[PDB]
Amino acid sequence: KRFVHVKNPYLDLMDEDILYHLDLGTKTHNLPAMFGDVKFVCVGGSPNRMKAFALFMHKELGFEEAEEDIKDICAGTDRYCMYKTGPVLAISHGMGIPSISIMLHELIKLLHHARCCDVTIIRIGTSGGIGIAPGTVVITDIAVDSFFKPRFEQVILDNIVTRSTELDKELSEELFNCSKEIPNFPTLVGHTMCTYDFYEGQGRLDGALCSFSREKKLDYLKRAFKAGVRNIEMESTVFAAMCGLCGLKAAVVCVTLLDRLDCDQINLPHDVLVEYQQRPQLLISNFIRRRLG
Amino acid sequence: KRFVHVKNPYLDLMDEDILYHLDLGTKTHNLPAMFGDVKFVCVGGSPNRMKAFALFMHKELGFEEAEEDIKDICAGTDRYCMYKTGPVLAISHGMGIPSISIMLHELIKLLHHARCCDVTIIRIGTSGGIGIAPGTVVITDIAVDSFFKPRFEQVILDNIVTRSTELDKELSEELFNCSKEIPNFPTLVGHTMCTYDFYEGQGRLDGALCSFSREKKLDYLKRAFKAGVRNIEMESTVFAAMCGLCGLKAAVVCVTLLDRLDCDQINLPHDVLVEYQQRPQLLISNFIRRRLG
Ligand SMILES: O=c1[nH]c(=O)n(COCCO)cc1Cc1ccccc1
Ligand SMILES: O=c1[nH]c(=O)n(COCCO)cc1Cc1ccccc1
Ligand SMILES: [Co+2]
Ligand SMILES: [Co+2]
Ligand SMILES: [Co+2]
Ligand SMILES: [Co+2]
Ligand SMILES: [Mg+2]
Ligand SMILES: [Mg+2]
């Protein structure tokens, strides 16, 4: 049994641990009772996406539906919103490295407090593609920074520390194998670039700020493609680094919404976009069903 | 008249601009009609905080209440949520530098498209204090990074570019003058440190990861205090940098919830916390009333 670890000798010395952004705590809640049975954590941007994911889990796998307390609705608050369906826990993380990092610190502590074991964690979401068809599901093999390097640079106090961004190889391979079973479901494995800015950080020409030319954009993106990058998003490096440090097996599965070699703004009918957006959760549902069979 | 500027020669060349994360666009909406009258933009973390701020604006200043479309509620989505009351626009930004940066790119473009002028923008929120009483409202004079330097480091394509984090001096002074009118309202001007991580980035001992000692935490925080830092949050440097680049007059006003020299977790009664949390909006309401008188 692979228990979820923390890397913090102070944590066990505390009288109580308050997970402020989850609205949970070790004294206020029975965390082993509430979460000890979690085997799969799926994380994504918005409360609504993740609530919908949990409902999909109910419908696809027949797990007990996530309970709703109507006098404490999480959506709209400063908390990360959780929706549990049997052994699957869906959690929102907002946008960007700092936002997901707060959620991950508190989630990893939660799984540790609950004495969970053999947990798989998977990020689902959207991304920009490079040189691949819009609607393609990319399974990340390695997450890279803006310089196409597999690293996450932490600032700890006033010191810079570099961490590796390795994602579980067997898991990425298993997800790719699952994808083969799904018809009309274009999938590939490739590197994923994670940036701190959506606009200039991704070579966009449509921000409030653009200090470079179209030619420089395309050169950057073509070099990224040569390095093996196939999509671009905003959470994968810190996700890979933290999950890796705490011995959790992690994967990233994102659909592309456009080919960035061609444009910066989406030009898809609404119904097609809806179709693309549900593709990662479809793969994850196949995966979980296979694991549990 | 000081119009809101962008720094992007490509923007005017586009047929249409889609502000995806605001759910607005130049073709789908009449942006000058909808927003040309905006003079004050207040930004903060959550949809609920900002909706409440807008209601407070209605009650305090008598501006028309923000309209609610019940078939398209923003809270819970991947969008930044807007609540307009007369010349005041309240907008949510989520947590952290990347999250606020996406909102700022689209907001600055919005104000430009709407031909707004003479706009003041103010971030309100919470923070950790250093060596000052919990509940203190800190008006930022300068925003600094984890190294106590007034800089914001952008990664543009694969290049690092440093930007200044100057906030409008006259504005910070005017807000401080307004605060003097409010009884039972502890306020100070000081530097604000902005970090990419809430836990190790702020010297916390309670994260899933803690790679340093209590002694090192306290030394870091004491050096920050010596530099002039009085509070710690997660958006001020990119906010100051972008607003500055686009010639918008900006300020940051955050209340402290704890003294980080003493603890990492909040220990306040709920009712006291509620009291503290509303302090920045109280100052902003005084400020706006004065400007409009
Ligand atoms: O190009 C992208 N880059 C990216 O980091 N993502 C991930 O989500 C960021 C917030 O929507 C998603 C996309 C696709 C996209 C394109 C235009 C508008 C919205 C999303
Ligand atoms: O110490 C802090 N650091 C900080 O960056 N903020 C700003 O908000 C971050 C998300 O809640 C707020 C605080 C106060 C605090 C302390 C404990 C829990 C929550 C918030
Ligand atoms: Co422990
Ligand atoms: Co490669
Ligand atoms: Co223009
Ligand atoms: Co100083
Ligand atoms: Mg193409
Ligand atoms: Mg003290």
Instruction: Looking at B130-181, list the stretches that DSSP marks H as alpha helix, in order from N- to C-terminal side.
Output: 169-180
Give the list of residues 6+ apart from residue B137 with CB closer than 8 angstroms, or none.
B179, B185, B186, B187, B188, B253, B254, B255, B279, B280, B283
**In ligand 1, which atom is closest to the CA atom of A265?**
17
Tell me if chain B has a CB within 8 Å of the CB of A12: no
Give the list of residues 6+ apart from residue A266 with CB closer than 8 angstroms, or none.
A257, A258, A273, B18, B20
Whether residue A197 and residue B98 make contact (CB cut-off 8 A), yes or no, is: yes
Return the residue whose CA atom lies nearest to atom 10 of ligand 2.
B95
Specify whether the CB–CB gap between B198 and B234 falls below 8 A. yes
Instruction: Read off the tokens for A229.
Output: 């990058």
Which strand (E) or helix (H) includes residue B139? strand B137-144
Among candidate residues B19, B44, B17, the one with its CA nearest the CA of residue B277: B44
Question: Ligand 1 pocket: which of A144, A146, A230, A233 to mutate (most atoms <8 Å of CB)?
Answer: A233
- Angle, CA B166 vertex, CA B163 and CA B168 arms, to 5°: 145
Among candidate residues A51, A241, A107, the one with its CA nearest the CA of residue A164: A241
Tell me if chain A has a CB within 8 Å of the CB of B197: yes
- Could you tell me how far CA A219 lies from the centroid of its own chain? 28
Strand, coil or helix: B253: strand
Residue A256, annotated as binding a ligand: no
Specify whether the CB–CB gap between A251 and A140 falls below 8 A. yes
Among candidate residues A203, A195, A205, the one with its CA nearest the CA of residue A222: A203
Instruction: Read off the tokens for B4.
Output: 């809101």
One-character DSSP codes across B106-137: HHHHHHHHTT-BS-EEEEEEEEEESSS-TTPE
d(CA A123, CA A43): 5
Among candidate residues A257, A200, A188, A192, the one with its CA nearest the CA of residue A229: A192
Indicate the fold that domain B1-293 takes in CATH.
Answer: Rossmann fold (3.40.50)
Specify whether the CB–CB gap between B137 and B280 falls below 8 A. yes
Strand, coil or helix: B197: coil
Residues 55-74 of B with CB under 8 A from A: none
Among candidate residues B235, B248, B249, B253, the one with its CA nearest the CA of residue B100: B235
Give the list of residues 6+ apart from residue B142 with CB closer than 8 angstroms, or none.
B150, B165, B166, B167, B191, B192, B240
Specify whether the CB–CB gap between A175 and A281 falls below 8 A. no
Segments of B165-270 assigned E as strands: 187-194, 229-233, 249-259
Whether residue B10 and residue A214 make contact (CB cut-off 8 A), yes or no, is: yes
Q: Is A137 exposed, middle or buried (0-12, 13-18, 19+ CB in 10 A)?
A: buried
Beta-carbon-side half-sphere exposure of residue B102 (alpha carbons within 13 Å): 27
Among candidate residues B89, B81, B82, the one with its CA nearest the CA of residue B39: B89
Among candidate residues A95, A87, A135, the one with its CA nearest the CA of residue A114: A87
Long-range contacts of residues B148-154, Cβ cutoff 8 Å, at least 24 apart: B148/A158, B148/B191, B148/B193, B148/B223, B148/B224, B148/B227, B148/B229, B151/B237, B152/B237, B152/B238, B152/B240, B152/B241, B154/A197, B154/A200, B154/A201, B154/B241
Strand, coil or helix: B68: coil
What b/e string do you get for B61-88 counting C-beta neighbours within 10 Å, with b at 16 or more? eebeebeeeeeeebbbbbbbbbbbbbbb
CB < 8 Å to B17, chain A? 206, 265
Which residue carries 């593709």 as its tokens? A279
Neighbour count for residue A202 (Cβ, 10 Å): 25
Residue A124, annotated as binding a ligand: yes
Which strand (E) or helix (H) includes residue B279? helix B279-292
Q: Is B89 exposed, middle or buried (0-12, 13-18, 19+ CB in 10 A)?
A: buried
d(CA B98, CA B100): 6
Among candidate residues B205, B200, B262, B254, the one with its CA nearest the CA of residue B232: B254
Min CA distance, A218 vs chain B (Å)? 10
Give the list of residues 6+ apart from residue A271 with CB closer than 8 angstroms, or none.
none
Q: Side chain identity at A282, as an amino acid letter?
A: L
**In ligand 2, which atom is closest to the CA atom of B198?**
5
CB < 8 Å to B270, chain A? none
Strand, coil or helix: B29: coil
Specify whether the CB–CB gap between A19 and A110 falls below 8 A. yes
Tell me if chain B has a CB within 8 Å of the CB of A247: no
Whether residue A205 and residue B146 make contact (CB cut-off 8 A), yes or no, is: no
Specify whether the CB–CB gap between A2 and A118 falls below 8 A. yes
Between the CA of residue A42 and those of A92, A258, A284, B77, B172, what are the distances in Å? Answer: 9, 24, 9, 17, 43
Among candidate residues B278, B255, B10, B36, the one with its CA nearest the CA of residue B134: B255
d(CA A131, CA A257): 12
Around ligand 2, the residues with Cβ closer than 6 Å are A 20, 78; B 95, 126-128, 198, 202, 232-234, 257-258, 265-266
d(CA B289, CA A227): 55
Beta-carbon-side half-sphere exposure of residue B104 (alpha carbons within 13 Å): 35
Instruction: Read off the tokens for B276.
Output: 């503290």
Q: Is B159 exposed, middle or buried (0-12, 13-18, 19+ CB in 10 A)?
A: middle
Long-range contacts of residues B214-223, Cβ cutoff 8 Å, at least 24 apart: B214/A10, B216/A157, B217/A157, B218/B261, B220/A157, B220/A158, B221/B130, B221/B260, B221/B261, B222/B261, B223/A158, B223/B148
CB < 8 Å to A154, chain B? 197, 200-201
Q: Is A26 in the pocket of ligand 1 (CB under 6 A)?
A: no
Domain extent listing, chain B: 1-293
- Residue B92 has φ and ψ, to the nearest 5°, of -80, 155
- Angle, CA A90 vertex, CA A88 and CA A94 arms, to 5°: 160
Between the CA of residue A235 and those of A77, A135, A238, B210, what are the distances in Å? Answer: 21, 19, 6, 21
Q: Is A202 in the pocket of ligand 1 (CB under 6 A)?
A: yes
Residue A277, annotated as binding a ligand: no
Min CA distance, B181 vs chain A (Å)? 30
Strand, coil or helix: B101: helix
Q: Is A217 exposed, middle or buried (0-12, 13-18, 19+ CB in 10 A)?
A: buried
d(CA B76, CA B82): 13
Among candidate residues B31, B95, B89, the one with its CA nearest the CA of residue B64: B89
d(CA B77, CA A25): 26
3-class DSSP string for chain A: CCECCCECCCHHHCCCCEEHHHCEECCCCCHHHHHCCCCEEEEECCHHHHHHHHHHHHHHHCCCCCCCCCCCCCCCCCCCCEEEECCEEEEECCCCHHHHHHHHHHHHHHHHHCCCECCEEEEEEEEEECCCCCCCEEEEEEEECCCCCCEEEEEECCEEEEEECECCHHHHHHHHHHHHCCCCCCEEEEEEEECCCCCHHHCCCCCCECCCCHHHHHHHHHHHHHHCEEEEECCHHHHHHHHHHCCCEEEEEEEEEEECCCCCCCCCCHHHHHHHHCHHHHHHHHHHHHHHC
CB < 8 Å to A223, chain B? 158
Min CA distance, B293 vs chain A (Å)? 32
Residues 162-181 of B with CB under 8 A from A: none
Question: Ligand 1 pocket: which of A92, A127, A235 to mutate (most atoms <8 Å of CB)?
Answer: A127
Resolution (angstroms) equals 1.5
What b/e string do you get for B94-105 counting C-beta neighbours within 10 Å, with b at 16 or more? bbbbbbbbbbbb
Neighbour count for residue A189 (Cβ, 10 Å): 17
Do strands B120-129 and B249-259 pair parallel, antiparallel, or not at all (unpaired)?
parallel
Which residue carries 């994504």 as its tokens? A44
Give the max Cα distance, chain B: 58
Specify whether the CB–CB gap between A127 and A138 falls below 8 A. yes
Beta-bridge partners for A143: A192
Give the list of residues 6+ apart from residue B107 with CB closer than 8 angstroms, or none.
B22, B41, B43, B80, B91
d(CA A47, CA A94): 8
Among candidate residues A18, A38, A40, A37, the one with its CA nearest the CA of residue A29: A18
Beta-carbon-side half-sphere exposure of residue B246 (alpha carbons within 13 Å): 34
Tell me if chain B has a CB within 8 Å of the CB of A198: yes
Which residue carries 């957006």 as its tokens? A277
Between the CA of residue B119 and those of B41, B56, B104, what are the distances in Å? Answer: 7, 20, 14
Dihedral sign for Cα atoms in the order A214, A220, A226, A230 = negative
Ligand nearest to the CA of A144: 4
Between the CA of residue B142 and those of A234, B145, B188, B227, what are the distances in Å? Answer: 27, 10, 13, 11
Question: Ligand 1 pocket: which of A198, A238, A270, A279 to mutate (most atoms <8 Å of CB)?
Answer: A198
Residue B128, annotated as binding a ligand: yes
Specify whether the CB–CB gap between A199 and A207 falls below 8 A. yes
Q: Is A99 in the pocket of ligand 1 (CB under 6 A)?
A: no
Q: Is A1 exposed, middle or buried (0-12, 13-18, 19+ CB in 10 A)?
A: exposed
